[PDB]
Amino acid sequence: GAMAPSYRVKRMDIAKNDEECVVNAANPRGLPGDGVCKAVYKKWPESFKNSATPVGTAKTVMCGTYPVIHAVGPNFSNYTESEGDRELAAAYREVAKEVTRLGVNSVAIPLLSTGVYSGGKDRLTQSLNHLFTAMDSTDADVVIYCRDKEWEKKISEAIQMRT
Numbered sequence: 001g002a003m004a005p006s007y008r009v010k011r012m013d014i015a016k017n018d019e020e021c022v023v024n025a026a027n028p029r030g031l032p033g034d035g036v037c038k039a040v041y042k043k044w045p046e047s048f049k050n051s052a053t054p055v056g057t058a059k060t061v062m063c064g065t066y067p068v069i070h071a072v073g074p075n076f077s078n079y080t081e082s083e084g085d086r087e088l089a090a091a092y093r094e095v096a097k098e099v100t101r102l103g104v105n106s107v108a109i110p111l112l113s114t115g116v117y118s119g120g121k122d123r124l125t126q127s128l129n130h131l132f133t134a135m136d137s138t139d140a141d142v143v144i145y146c147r148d149k150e151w152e153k154k155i156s157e158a159i160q161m162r163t
């Protein structure tokens with residue numbers, strides 16, 4: 001585990017992370033996709049061998065010795081707000097189990113269901129709070145990746161409020 005487990009946020013491509021493993025914001029079919037998923041496919045294509053997994057779950061596939069944890073958040077265009085909230089919380093709980101099982105000291109994670117699976121709604125707080133609920137009991141250093149300047153400021157504020 002990390003000596004003093006922390007949360008940090010960086011505004012950059014998660015494919016350039018400086019952590020011991022990465023969480024892909026995957027689709028259930030293991031396809032290259034778009035956004036974070038397409039960047040992950042270009043950087044670690046070998047990790048997409050048998051990576052298909054249902055909504056609400058996470059499946060890890062190794063690229064060399066580097067773990068890629070494919071986590072499938074719900075697409076809010078298809079789920080109700082109630083059922084989607086439950087599956088989004090569940091995907092993050094499965095990421096925490098995988099990070100623990102892998103024994104890594106750090107993990108790079110995106111905010112699941114906040115891009116093309118958001119159903120056109122701002123889900124920063126919803127997704128980040130489910131990330132904290134799952135990851136708080138792990139001892140890995142967590143580094144959250146985002147691309148928008150206003151999102152970086154809001155995520156940073158939410159991390160600092162708890163310290």
Ligand SMILES: [Cl-]
Binds near residue numbers: 013016
């Ligand atoms: Cl970048």
Ligand SMILES: [Cl-]
Binds near residue numbers: 114117
């Ligand atoms: Cl998304």
Ligand SMILES: [Cl-]
Binds near residue numbers: 146147148151
């Ligand atoms: Cl973003």
